[PDB]
Amino acid sequence: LEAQYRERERAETEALLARYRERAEAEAKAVREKAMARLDEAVALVLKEVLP
Amino acid sequence: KLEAILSQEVEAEIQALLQEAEAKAEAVKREAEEKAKALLQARERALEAQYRAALRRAESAG
Structure with missing residues (x-):
């Protein structure tokens, strides 16, 4: 009973991780693409603050 | 006459006893x-807990 309970959690706790890995890199990707299209705006904001 | 039959009045008391102890050999079981x-x-319950716990940990890690 132990044996098939330990093998129950293992065969889910690799699948769950594997799937979380797919989501981690898409949710990294989901902030990069927003940022590079709201880019000229950061640069411009910073500039007008380093000429003082 | 009761001679051989004399012995069946015991084998009936000492059959009562042996059934009372096969009414304990059932209770024991x-x-x-x-x-x-x-x-x-x-x-069952303790393993169930350790499987609830193992997936919850692995979600917080994920």
Whole structure:
């Protein structure tokens, strides 16, 4: 009973991780693409603050 | 005459006894089935907890 309970959690706790890995890199990707299209705006904001 | 039959009046008292102890050899087995069973109800719940716990940890990690 132990044996098939330990093998129950293992065969889910690799699948769950594997799937979380797919989501981690898409949710990294989901902030990069927003940022590079709201880019000229950061640069411009910073500039007008380093000429003082 | 009772001679051989004389012995069947004992074999009937000493058959009453032997059935009273096969009414204890049943009771003993009842309690022992209800024991063996309960050791696996505890086995079931504790493992269930350790599987609830193992997936919850692995979600917070994920």
